[PDB]
């Protein structure tokens, strides 16, 4: 038993009433919201929560957080769903202790997943072991957001503390990847799916930022300091300080100090290495840097992205450098910016040329104060659904009946987030 049907239905009724001038949004909103809740969420024998991301019995730390985030509003009313979200944080943290370098975990210790192709330290709980900094950001973000929105604190247990320590340790080790016990090689012809230099990745200098193998797209980093993931790290490291101080958790003085030191070191790394210049000579954030002087000018639709920086809480939407970066990202100066008959937006190394991501359109609306822009993007999201009434991974700018991922809950839920944002439901 996952949530209260009666309370959720009543909440959805209220949302529908507020959005009554936009039946087409309500149609898609209810379809996305209910699908995720009814088909991806399950309670395990130990009472914790496992969240599927599609059909495969595996949970991404990233997807599971993003999928359940918009249930926080109704979780203020539905105490059962509040337990369910608490149970997800507990399962995420338990899994982090299993292996903090893994992005995706099995429902039980079953050795399902990518083990036949993947050369790396593996155990039976790991579906995939692509190390992505954001994977460890997302559970801390969820734990914090659950606490702030509902007041729930049961997720802050001893496994939470142990997992927090593991994250701080890993992030610190990875401030100089020369010392890392992580290597990853996949037997594949697709180079985005494996790391260069026999599993070690590209060259880097120490910058104070923390190293990543892969992006939230699951494609490998071109340079190792992935700017939007270090931004998210800075934010959740603030969350860690707030949580440990407020709740007098075991070893607070130590954890707070480590988190603060790490935060300040990553912040300084961003300040010294994250910036570059666009065609017009404006200062902008780079997407990836190596500390050796290379810095790419682009953004990827997967979050954390440079576009999502204010949505992640890293900077103000009004920040000058953010706005310059956003102008550059949403233009052909970004090699993943695509323009067509039906829409313009952001493609990815992970999807076909000319296909753009609803998720980045949702994030675009979530990161502008312009209500007309939010409305435009919402209308565009529903108009470009290929007649399916749900959100896809990517769709072709000249023909949205061409698209990838029939069932993509993350995108479904980010649509819901933009709708709630438009409605000032907060």
User: Phi and psi (nearest 5°) for 5?
Assistant: -55, -40
User: Phi and psi (nearest 5°) for 276?
Assistant: -145, -165
b/e per residue 241-251 (b: at least 16 CB within 10 A):
bebbeeeebee
Tokens of 387: 């007649």
Give residue limits of the domains in the chain: 1-423
DSSP lists the bridge partners of residue 310 as: none
Q: What CA–CA distance (Å, rounded) separates 415 from 402?
A: 19
Q: Is the dihedral of CA 369, 371, 373, 378 positive or negative?
A: positive
Please report which helix (H) or strand (E) contains residue 48, including its range.
none
In angstroms, this model's resolution equals 2.2
Asked if the peptide bond before residue 304 counts as cis, ω within 30 degrees of 0, the response is: yes
Tell me which residue of 71, 92, 90, 91 sits closest to 82, measured CA to CA.
71
The residues near 364 (Cβ < 8 Å, ≥ 6 apart) are: 307, 330, 345, 373, 377
CATH of span 1-423: 1.50.10.10
Side-chain half-sphere exposure of 186, counting CA atoms within 13 A:
20
Task: List C-alpha distances in Å: 387 to 172, 183, 391, 406.
Answer: 47, 43, 10, 12
Q: Are 331 and 338 in contact (CB under 8 A)?
A: no
């Amino acid at each position: 038993m996952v949530y209260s049907k009666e309370i959720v239905r009543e909440w959805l009724d209220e949302v529908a009433e507020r959005a009554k001038d936009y039946p087409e949004w309500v149609d898609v909103f209810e379809r996305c919201y209910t699908d995720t809740l009814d088909n991806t969420v399950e309670i395990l024998e130990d009472g914790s929560t496992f969240v599927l991301t599609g059909d495969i019995p595996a949970m991404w730390l990233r997807d599971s957080t993003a999928q359940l985030r918009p249930y926080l509003h109704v979780a203020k009313r539905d105490a059962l769903l509040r337990q369910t979200i608490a149970g997800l944080v507990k399962r995420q943290m338990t899994l982090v202790l299993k292996d903090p370098y893994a992005n995706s975990f099995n429902i039980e210790e079953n050795w399902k997943g990518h083990h036949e192709t993947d050369h790396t330290d593996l155990n039976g709980w790991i579906w995939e072991r692509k190390y992505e900094v954001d994977s460890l950001c997302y559970p801390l973000q969820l734990a914090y957001l659950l606490w702030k929105e509902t007041g729930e604190t049961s997720q802050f247990d001893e496994i939470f503390v142990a997992a927090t320590k593991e994250i701080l340790h890993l992030w610190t080790v990875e401030q100089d990847h020369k010392n890392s016990p992580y290597r990853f090689v996949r037997d594949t012809d697709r180079k985005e799916d494996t790391l260069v230099n026999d599993g070690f990745g590209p060259d880097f200098a120490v910058t104070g930022m923390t190293w990543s193998a892969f992006r939230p797209s699951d494609d490998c980093c071109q340079y190792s300091y992935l700017i939007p993931s270090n931004m998210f790290a800075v934010v959740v490291l603030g969350y860690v300080q707030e949580i440990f101080a407020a709740l007098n958790l075991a070893d607070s003085q130590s954890v707070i100090a480590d988190a603060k030191r790490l935060q300040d070191e990553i912040q300084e790394g961003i300040k010294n290495y994250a910036y570059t210049t666009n065609s017009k000579g404006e200062k902008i954030y780079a997407f990836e840097v190596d500390g050796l002087g290379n810095a790419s000018i682009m953004d990827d639709p997967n979050v954390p992205s440079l576009l999502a920086a204010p949505y992640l809480g890293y900077c103000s939407v009004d920040d000058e450098v953010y706005q310059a970066t956003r102008r550059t990202i949403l233009s052909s100066e970004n090699p993943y910016f695509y323009q067509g008959e039906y829409a313009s937006g952001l493609g990815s190394s992970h999807t076909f040329y000319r296909y753009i991501w609803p998720i980045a359109l949702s994030i675009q609306g979530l990161t502008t104060r312009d209500k007309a822009e939010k409305k435009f993007l919402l209308d565009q999201l529903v108009a470009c659904d290929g007649g399916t009434g749900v959100m896809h991974e990517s769709f072709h700018v000249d023909d949205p009946t061409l698209y990838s991922r029939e069932w993509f809950s993350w995108a479904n839920m980010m649509f819901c987030e933009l709708v709630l944002d438009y409605l000032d439901i907060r």
